[PDB]
Structure formats: structure tokens, C-alpha cells
Design a protein around this ligand. Sequence first.
Ligand SMILES: [Zn+2]
Lengths: 399, 148, 35, 626, 140, 106, 258
Amino acid sequence: LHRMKDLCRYMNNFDSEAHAKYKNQVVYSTMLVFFKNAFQYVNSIQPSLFQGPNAPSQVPLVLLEDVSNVYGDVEIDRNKHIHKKRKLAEGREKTMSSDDEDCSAKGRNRHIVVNKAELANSTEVLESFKLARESWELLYSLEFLDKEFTRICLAWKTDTWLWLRIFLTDMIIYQGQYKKAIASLHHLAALQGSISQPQITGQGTLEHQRALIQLATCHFALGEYRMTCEKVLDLMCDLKLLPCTSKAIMPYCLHLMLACFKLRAFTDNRDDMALGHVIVLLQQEWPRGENLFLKAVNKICQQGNFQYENFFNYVTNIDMLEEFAYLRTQEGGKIHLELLPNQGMLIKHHTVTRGITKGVKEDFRLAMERQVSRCGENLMVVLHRFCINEKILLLQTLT
Amino acid sequence: PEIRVTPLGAGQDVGRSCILVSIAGKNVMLDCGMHMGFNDDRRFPDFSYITQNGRLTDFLDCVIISHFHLDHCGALPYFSEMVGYDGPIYMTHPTQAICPILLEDYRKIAVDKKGEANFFTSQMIKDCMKKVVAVHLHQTVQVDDELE
Amino acid sequence: SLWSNRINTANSRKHQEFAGRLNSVNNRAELYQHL
Amino acid sequence: MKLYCLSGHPTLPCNVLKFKSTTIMLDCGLDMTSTLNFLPLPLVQSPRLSNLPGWSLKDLDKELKECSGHVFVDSVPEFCLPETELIDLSTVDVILISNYHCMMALPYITEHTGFTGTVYATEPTVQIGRLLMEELVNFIERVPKAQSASLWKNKDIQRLLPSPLKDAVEVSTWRRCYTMQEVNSALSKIQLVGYSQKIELFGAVQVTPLSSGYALGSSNWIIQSHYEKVSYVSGSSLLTTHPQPMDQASLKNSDVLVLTGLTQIPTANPDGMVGEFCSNLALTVRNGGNVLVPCYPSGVIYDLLECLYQYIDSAGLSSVPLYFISPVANSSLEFSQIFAEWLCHNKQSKVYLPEPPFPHAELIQTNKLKHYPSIHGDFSNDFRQPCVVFTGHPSLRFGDVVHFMELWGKSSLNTVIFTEPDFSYLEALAPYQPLAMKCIYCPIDTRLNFIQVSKLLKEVQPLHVVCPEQYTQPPPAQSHRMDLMIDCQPPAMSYRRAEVLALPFKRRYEKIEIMPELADSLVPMEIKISLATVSAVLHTKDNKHLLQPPPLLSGSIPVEQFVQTLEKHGFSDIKVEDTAKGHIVLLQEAETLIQIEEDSTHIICDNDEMLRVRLRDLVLKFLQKF
Amino acid sequence: SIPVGISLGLLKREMAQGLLPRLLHGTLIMKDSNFRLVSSEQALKELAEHQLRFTCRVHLHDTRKEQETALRVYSHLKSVLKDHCVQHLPDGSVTVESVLLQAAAPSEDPGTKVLLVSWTYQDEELGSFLTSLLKKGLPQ
Amino acid sequence: KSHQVLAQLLDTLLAIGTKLPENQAIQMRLVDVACKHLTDTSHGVRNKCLQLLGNLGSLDVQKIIGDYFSDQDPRVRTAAIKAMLQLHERGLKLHQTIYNQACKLL
Amino acid sequence: PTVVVMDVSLSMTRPVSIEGSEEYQRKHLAAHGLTMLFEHMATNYKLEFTALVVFSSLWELMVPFTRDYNTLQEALSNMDDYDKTCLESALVGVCNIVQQEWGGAIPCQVVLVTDGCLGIGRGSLRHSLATQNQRSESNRFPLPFPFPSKLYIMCMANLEELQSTDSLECLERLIDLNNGEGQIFTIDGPLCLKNVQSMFGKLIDLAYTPFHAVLKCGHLTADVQVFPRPEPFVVDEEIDPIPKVINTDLEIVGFIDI
Ligand SMILES: [Zn+2]
């Protein structure tokens, strides 16, 4: 993992004859590191393609954006959350779509905060997973190793090849280029379904869903919140915590959107839509979502107004409804509450007020009863409905 | 952790079958027969072995009768009513049906053909039958919390 | 000593002894002593 | 954890549970209501049924017959079996029979399906079931009829037929009556079990039949694996019936309570209906008419016979005869008499003094009840016209009841009284509709109603309840009675025919026995509670596990205690390195090292082997395995 | 005999590797006046945790190439040892339970060759033999 | 993975083998795969594997079946004895060593 | 008369806490309270007049009095809502109203599902019940309502979960600081299904209890016997640390005059 720091410390473009031994050793070390990283990526992210016809053909996993790092205090950036998220994800290194190659220096710019039980190893496994990008970049620095990697990618049909596709997906995931991950997700459906080998077949493939989730994370890192939400909805129907099953992929899609909304709200931006999304996402994880809820409350107070199609009238998220009700008063900054379209009455002003004697009160009671009846229902359907009916707010928040 | 068995009747003889078993602190009587041929004071088993001048119900939690023969159930009414055992007595349905008539016949014999100064009566036979709990074939009854 | 604690627990919760067994000699007791 | 339900009939269930290592069949059941779609089998070829007009369609005609609008099948009656092809019955290890009513269809399972397991049932259930299959085979084979009808079973043809024939389901799975050789073979594979008898199935699970109080030998079953218990509540009764009452206590602490055999016609009080039946037959007899009582030879006939014995003496109707015609009549009466120890305390007390339990022995002694094996024997010589006859199958499709319906059906004076609720009395009566006979429906079902089962559920408190889906909805006739439902604090999941239920009762902590020899070597500790460590060899025999005599550690080792306590326990020249959130201790002898993480410790040895074991043992002073 | 409850997972794992020379190791918790035998993980889950391991770095006596120190030493398991599971990986390492040997560069400390030998108390035989024969048992 | 489906597939394999008794290589493949799944924890799987070994088998197989006379599950023991009996009925000459193993089972 | 102190916040109609108060939503807790306390409600709280009326800022007596004996759970079960949100008049205002228009001695059952949520920052209003120590500026005001009242415990947020942002003290120190009536009824940690009726379960068997005591002078020949037992009563502590007993030194002396 750290051995690439010594091999890459020599002259990259050294003499072919004068430093023949050094160049050969560097090339061999780079090739071995690239092979080890490819094998590790294939094992961790491609469990179905790495299994033969008689093998178990388990559900493959995927690597997601370091949203926990942004939420965590290790990478708590006071003014590097909105525009620097892509920079924090990729390091501005993997500009090009490198198939079967990782050109990124994020391993040294930051680290992975993994405990003894969160990951397999707090020293070996985490360093090996994080240093894959650094080792691959060091290999690409050497001309011979880079040429060998390019030749392997070209000859091996990297889209079709399991190890090279896994490496490309991991590189795109860290780079934030959602297009490459989306293309991989599209190819992972037909490739797995039309092959006689044992894997996940059809549209409901675990590898395809995991790749779609990775594409959503990359889109969220790139700042395209609408594209990330669309990818997350499609999937639903350095290190991160995520299971290898396809069922767990759906409940992890909203994490990237929640991180982006929290980063936007905590920044100078006063986008009320991001605050509403973060409030809706407050029930996803706790007490990690408490910071997101606080940022949402601060953004709502700063903006002073909100615009949405259906937040408390039809959406039945318990946490979102409670947050909206709490923020309707002066606790949320004494701002107007808009649950229905051009409705909500006055709750920011003094409590002693008449307004509508029994019309607005009856409408609010009916909306609350409808939300309570649908409270048992999952928030995924409500989120998808708001993502389609109220896409204007999401688009405004995204830019 | 010991099983202590004390046959105070029919140990090396036939007749007056009455065996005490202490297995896990549960003291059970395995029969309550009587001896035939003995005239007095040896017809019935020695119940002074179980701390006489006291309540037998505390010591014994279960009394079992194999069948209705007098050398296996003859001393049952005397034992129960006279010495004061009010606990359960287990015996099969035909044993329950045919036991009291044998006792009645022997009671008739004792009151007519012999003396009856120290014998039981029909009302005292019927009193004993009240405590009886009928048990069917292969019926794993739970006489106690752990004893079955 | 797992066979010690459970055996002690079982023996602790027990019931009164027979008078004859307390008065027995060589695990045998005379019956019908009054005669 | 699984439950394959092979029959949609509520009162005739057939459920298999793939629970633990054994798949146990609960009841067999035979949906006899399929016979109502067929033309009845008469003892003598009647002119009315033979000359019935065939049904017309655009195509056949001789297979189907029409009588007063209803369309029937001119073929031998067939019986709707439980779904046998859903699960390979060769894998079924044990069959548990609750009632003699649920005992039917057993020859099919035992013979035709390659079943090689065991059958467990109570002796009165076995004997009465034997009588029922005896009389069923006798009725079916008495005057055999061909099975020419097969076109109407077609999927595209059954749709156009009228309602009773169109709504029949699993028609292709219907089979003719089993032969008597199959009956004798099936009953040979049976083991007789008494109430509360613990039967061990391959050392895995224990099953006991518990008295249900519904019939003679009727039993509820509880299957348990020493931690998870499954209770099977078949037809049961909490009334003052002859059998000993329900053993409700043993059903407590049940993870799953599969519940079948609930009463049909829940609105009916059986005592009132018995009184109504007696009053109706007394009224008919007083006017000189006859009475026909289709019934099983050994079911509710005894209770209504007792009530009739009580009623006639006050009613002044001792003169009229009480005929009971069935091939198994004398066998039924004798079996009812001899099973005296299978009765309640009130009626089993009749064994002490010499007296038969049932009173119909007195009916026979005073020549009030007269049982015969058929119509052609001494019955035709001793027949007196103003009489009452118990005979035939209640389905009104075979037995002597067909002959008596065809005989007395032309007069309004005679009456037919239905007491068994398992057959739709309008549908069983369909092949005879233009009769002038007075038809009375007063079913007598002593089984549990929904109030009784609600009280039993609140008494028992099972974690999950399984019942037919018919009980999770009000009956279609009412469709508005919320009281005729199974109301439980859990949702009380249900099933339909050929449905597989994945029960959530999967639990860990299977039991195991440790012998004293290994327990001597096992020593406990103290933690924060007792705990010990066991290293042994596992011996398994007949699904009973025995522990024969042949990573994690826990404790309190904070950085301060680590630095202080073991500082000078035998070594020397020790330095402490100021590491964050801990301390690093290494010795200068060979750079041997000890590093501690949060709630963790580990020992490093560098070119040293002899001192490493003692280094580990020093830390093991206060390290348990919790 | 002592009535005891053994967890289903541990019971299944008993013959998962012990069907064909075998042993069963577990921890018995006499908690809440009942006996409940479980594995170590469920013992942790019950309720004072402080893990103790061995991850020793024995200063290797073998002074040869990097390849000899790393890629040749680690194949010392299959010599005579038994009751050890076998799992194949293309990359190159021996991962049998809590065993890892491919640590790092052959000599990072300014001394002789250093390699990390790791083992636990249940698999103490392999780690002990490796450390013993690596302390001085592999001379040049 | 599941045990019921595995047992049913073994039943299917038995049906296919009985449908092609004249085919030899198919039966060797069938007995090989029966031996492979003969160590499953489910008694049903072992029962079907022993049934395959009984209906299909070269005429080694007696030793393989004989090993399961000591199986903990009694119905697996019955399946093994029935497999040996069916092998004998097919024409195989059993070894005298089976006598002592069967004597213990009485 | 006595008025139950219901929260006039908009969040009262919806569930409580930031993400979850305890077990399922408020409807399940209300149903559990109705089922467990039905026997006690039908026998001990037949004359407690409480009305589940709507309020804008604080509990007020507007609707006519009614004999609500088994409708206490209905107050928190599908209750109506109003277009008002007053966090400062939820507990302080209701307590003041109870103290003034209902007095410190009146049968009041303050049992309802309320959010009890503070602000998302430096806006914690702990003076509603903890005015003795926190918010000493209002120490001379009528707060913290030092009078007998019904226990109101808000165990919504977990102390361990809220300790991450150092806000655990504000959420946890609510029930215990509410006048310290007898003992601190505050549970910190995870929530379970049985916790819904835990607050209402404190007086399940505390309605009546049998006892044995006879009042007489000396020996007498027509001494009166008291079959039913009265409520607990003790004059000292050393003489009555356990249930009362009778001695063997009965004597009659002293003049009786009014
Ligand atoms: Zn004898």
C-alpha cells in the first residue's frame, strides 16, 4: 500500500540503459500494484462477474462517495462544501475517463476515517483500498507501466472485461463522472443477462443497481442534483459503509443527496429546497442527520421563504412533517410555511390570530390526517413523487 | 444427585408391596399393598418409617398403584385415611374401578370371619377413593412442576 | 467447577428426610419395632 | 418456519409444516362437497333420476343432467382431494390426525402418493374413521356407476356451465372413492396414541395429542422443539359434551397457533337447534308423517339421540320406532359404548358402578332404538310407517338416504331434518327439488364459534395465529358481522388453498446436554454476571446433541492501569512512549513491544520466543472472554 | 447432564468444518440464572470488551532478497500442519482465520528483516511455529 | 442453496437416470454428483443421494453407502440400508463386511 | 376547573421528537394507554372533567365541562389542530392558567402526546419547569409553578444520541426538574414498545390496598371492626417504617370532651 511511495520516488522518465535495473524494478512494481488493485476492486465490487457458472454468483457491491467524510468532523470544511465537493471527491486529477486506470491523487490529499469494526482492518485493508488510486497514478507516471495499462485496456475489451470494468467504475465513482458509471450500469445489465455464466440476470441485476447508485453518487459529487436524483430513482425501482445486496442499494441512494443538501445549506447559499430535502433526509441516519437538520433550519431562517408543491399536504415523512411544523413558528427563523400550493396560513407571526375561522383549519386537519394515515408507507414513493411533481425546487437547489 | 430406594414391603418376599423412591427430593410411594396370612400388625406396611406422628402429605408428593391386587393396593384406605395422607394417588381407570370392590370383599371377610378391631370400613374406603387421580395409558401427567 | 455449582443448587432445594433412614444402620432399619 | 396448506376447506384442513428437520402433515381431510355436483347414487334405479332431461349446449348432453334448473353430472360422485402435487408427499415424515372427519383422504395419501412415513392418531378416532370409510366404500360400491363424465372438466367448457358447476374448483384433481383394500392398507400404517402422550419424532420434535372435547378421540396437537412450540387447534368444543373438555392450558407459550376446524353457521346455538330438531320431528310424527335424519353413523347422532330419549317420554311418543340404518350401525353403537374412559368426569364416573356410559343401551333394551345394517334385511319386516330414520350420507348422494328421499319425497306429511352443517342443505337437496317433503335445516355444530375462540386466544396469547382466510373475513351470507371474525393483536396471518406461509418463528438457541465429566473441567468467572469457556467435541445421535470432553477477550485494562499495574511484574528497563489516546510500551532486550488500542491490546515479539508466552500470560491476569 | 442452549449458528458451524479430527470452542454464559452456550461474537453481543491478539513482528534471521523474504516465507503452512482451512486467492497471501503474513517491505526498521506474524489463541499452533522458525530457524 | 430445492433436483436427477439406464457415462456423472452432495446437513439431501447411489451404481459404492450406517439421523440410516438392498436387487454381490455393520443396526 | 396542559404547538398533531419519540406514532401510544388504563380510568377517574378542545396559545376553559372518564386517550388520538404555534405558552402559560383558574389543589390528569421540542440552537426554553436553577432572571416570577400538579414527562430524545452536539442536558433535564414530585421519572436511552404505558402505569395498583387495623380503647365488649382499608397514613417515621402491628399492652385512659 505504501510501497508505491518509494518506487515512484525515483526518476519517472529515467534512462533506459543507465537505469535499466531501476526502470525494470519500477515497472514490475507498478504492474504488480495495478494487478493487486484490479483484483481487489473486482473482488469487492464485482462478485457476480468474478464467479463461474457453478459458483455462488453473489450480489456485487459498489463504492460510493465519501459523504460520511464531509458530514464527519475530520473533513469539516467551513467554506469548501458547495463547489469543493467535486474537488474533495476527485482531487481535480481524473479529468479524463481512464478505463482500467486510476489517475487520482486523493489518497494523499485526504484519508479514510474507518474504525476497528467499521472496516476489516484499520491499518491494512483501509490503506490498501485508499492507495489504489495513488499506486495507479504512480504507475501511469512511468511510461512503460502506463503503456502496458493502456494496451491491456484496449486489448482486453475493458467494458466487457470484469476487472477492467470494476476499475473503471471505481475510477468514475471517485472522479465524479456520472456518464461513465451510467454507461457501465447500462452495459452491466445486458452483459450479465445475455451471458450463460451464473450472475444477476435481467433488469433487476445487483451489479447494475450498484453501478446506478455509484452513478448517482458521482452525479451528486459533480453538482448535478437533478441527474443524481433521477439516477437514484431509477436505481430504486475513500471508504464508505454499504452492503453488497441490491436491497440495501435503494436506501443508500438518498445519502449523497442529503450530503449535497447539507453542504449547500451550511454554505452561504440559502436554498430553501435544499433545506427541505435535508429535513426529509433527517430520518435516514441519526445522530448524523442532526447536523443536516440544523443546517436546514439555518438555511430556512436565512431565506425567510419556501416554495414547494407537496411537503406536508401529501408527503407523509414523519421527520420532515415534524421539522416543518417546528420551523413554522419562530424557532425556524419566523418564516412563512408553505405546505400546499400558495397555502399555509400565518404561523410565523403571533399565535393569537383568526385568519380563516374553520376553512384553513379544516384543510390543515385533513392534510395532517392524510399524512398520518400514510405515515406507515415508505418515504421512497413520496420522495419520487416530489422529485417529479416538484422538480422546479430541485432544479433551483441544484443551480 | 442420588436415587434412594427403600422397599419396606416385598423386599425379599411376595406381599405387602410398598416401595419408597427418593430420586431428586421427590419421595414417591410405589405401591400400598397388604400381606396375606399375617393376623395382626403385619398386614399393612410399616408407615412409622416415614416419621410417624406427623403429616405424610408433606413427605410424599405422589402415591402410585400398579394394579388392584390386595398385595399391591390392599393397605390403601388404612394408609390414606388413618395415617392422614391427603395427597394424590395415581392408578389406571380399571384399577380405580376394580380396587374398591376387592377392599369391600376383604372388609366383609375381616368383619365376619375374623376380628375387626383395627380394620377399616366401607365409608373409610370411599373416603380414600376421593384422592385418587385416574391416569390413562401412556398419559405423561405432571404431578409436580418437574416430576412426571 | 460447573458440575459443582449446579449440584449445589440442586441439593440446596430439597425436602425432609425419612425418620427410618436417619435412624438406619448399614443402610438397613428394623421394621415394626413396637412388636 | 414454513407451512404448506394443501386444502382451502376450513373445517377439512391439510397443512404441512417444514419446521426443523421434519415435515409434519396436520390432518388429511376430504372435501366431500364436490359430491353435491353429481347425481345421487340410488340403491334401486329410480324412474325420476334416470329420465331426467339432459342439458343443452352448442356442441356434452349425456354427461350433464338438468333437474329443476340446476345442472348435475350423470356420473359416480367424486371427492376433491388436498393438493398433493404442491409438495412431494414422499418427504412427509409424520401425519397427525385430529378427528375422524379429518381422517378421510388418508388412503389417497398413504397409497397413491408414495408416502412412507408414520401416522399418529387416537384410538377412538382410528376406529370411528374406520367405520366412516367402511360405510363410504359400502355406499359407493353398493351399486357401482361408471365415470364416463370427463368433457365437463375441460377448462374452456366449465366456464359456460351454470353457477354450482362453474364455481367448482380443482375439478381436474377430483378422484373416485378409494377401494377397501386401500382403506385397510392405510389403517395398517397407524400408531395409536393416548392423550398427553409424548411422541418423539427422530429425537427432533415432540408431539402430544390434547383432548379437544369436540368428538370421541378428537385431539389438538402441540409440536415443540424445546424452545419453539407450534400449537394445532383443530375442531374443538367447550360445551358440556361427552368427551373430556379442552386442555386449554397446554396451548400456552405457543410461538405459532395454527387454527382450523371452527364452526360453520356461527349464529346457531347448538342447544336451541337440538330443541328445535326434537320439536319439529315430534310435530311431524304426531301428524302421522315420517322423519328422515341424514347423519353420520357416529357423529352428532349420539347427542340428539340422548335428547330424543329424554324428549319422547314427556312427549308421549314412545310407541314410534327409532330406526338407525347403516352398514356400521352396530359397530358405531358398540364403539361409542366401550370408549368410556375417553369421556368427561361426569360420564366416565359410570365405570365405577356397573353401567354403560351412553343411555342408548337403554333405548335398545326397551326396544326404542332399532339399528339395522341395511334396508333389505330385517328392517323391511319390522318397518312401521310413522317412524324416524337416521341413515345415509348427509351429502344426500349415496346411502339409504337416497332411497328414503325418493320414497317419502312425494308427500308433504314426511320431513327431512338436516343436522350436519358441512353440506349446503339447499345444494344437497338440489337433485330432488320438486318434492313436497317438508325440509327443515337445524344444524348442530358444537365446534368453537368466534366469541369462544376470541376468549381462548386472549387466554392463551399466542405470538402468531394461522387460520384459513375464510375466518379473516365475515361469512359471505352475512358480510357485515364484524363479530364473526378472528380479532388478534397481531394481524393473524391467513392462508388459501396451495399457499405457502413463511412463518417468522425462526429462533436460535437449540438445546444441548453437557455431561458431568466435561462440567467438572468447566469453571465459571465473574463479569459485568457469570461466564465460562468451553472447548469440547460435539457428538450427535438421533438429532440429540451431546458435548463430550476431548477469538475474543474481555476485561478492564485502561491505559493508566496498563502502565501502572504490570510495570514491574518480572522484567526491567521499560520505557513508555507518549502516544495519543494510549501508551506504547517496548523493552530494550530485543525491541519486544506492547501496543494498546481503545478497548484492545496486543503483544509484539521481536526476535524473541521464550518470553512471549509469559508476556501474554501477564496480561491474562484480569482478562476474561466476555 | 447439564441442560444448555447452544446457538444455531455455532451448532451449524460445528459440522460446517468438523464433519470430517474436530473440535468445538465456545463461551458459556450463565446469565439470568440460565445456561446459554454461544460463540465469542454472541458473547460480545450479550454485554466490558477488551480484545487481546497476537500480531508480532519477529526480526527475521533470513538475510536474502526482498522476494525471498516476502513471497517465499509465507508458504510455510502446508508443510506438515493440519486442521487448517484452504482458500485460494490470485493475489498471493495466506488468509486462514486470523492469519496474515504479507505485511510490508522486508526491512523497514534499521536492522535485519522484519515481518509481521499474526495469530490468535485458537490458531496459536501456526503462529507459534512460524515465529519459532523465523526467530533463528531460517539462516542464510 | 436451499435444501428442499436441492432434494427435489436430486429427485429429478434420479428420474433422468432411471429414464436412461443403458447410458453409462450419464450414470457415472450422476453418482459422482450424488457423492458430491452426500455430505449436506439436510437429511433429505442425503436420502436422495443414497437413493441415487442405490438405483445407479457400478456393479466402492458399497463402502460409500456403508459409511452412512452410522449417520446420526435414523432415516438416513434407513435410506442407506434400502440403497444397499436395492443395489443387491439390481444384481450386485454385496460384501460379507456388510453383515457386521447391519448387525449393529438391529 | 382543572385543565390538562396540552401543547398548542403545530407539531402536537404530528409525532414527537426530531425523528422518533418512542415505539410507533402517537396513535399507538394513545391506544396502549387506553387499553392498559381502562380499568383504572373506569374506577378512579370518573369525576375528572377534562375536555380535548383546541387551543391557539395555551390551555383555556372555553368548552363546557363534561364527565370524561375513558376519553383521556382520545385527546391524543386523532386530535384536531389549529393554525397557531406558541412554544413559550405551551407549559408556562398552561401551568399559570392551572394555578390561577384551577388552583394548586384540583384533580388534573395531564396525559397527552406532545412534541416538547426546543429550538435548533441557542433557543432552549428550560424555564417552563426548571426555573429554580436555569433562567434565574424569572426566578421571582410565578414560575416554576410550585404547586401540586400532574406529572408531565417528555422522554422524547435519547441522552446518548443528543450528547453528540452537547444538547443532551436540555432534553433530559425536563421531567426530573418538574418540581421534583417524589422521584425523578426520566428514562434516558433507547425506547421500547412497553415504554408508552410506563408513564401511565405508575398508578395501576396504587388505587386501593387491603390492611389490618382496629381502633378501640382498652379491651371493651362492643369494639368496632373496620373491614375496608383506608388510605395510607403515618404521623412519624421511626414508629411506622413498615406496616402497622398490634402490641400486647392495650390500655384505655383519658377524658373525652369537646
Ligand atoms: Zn402381585
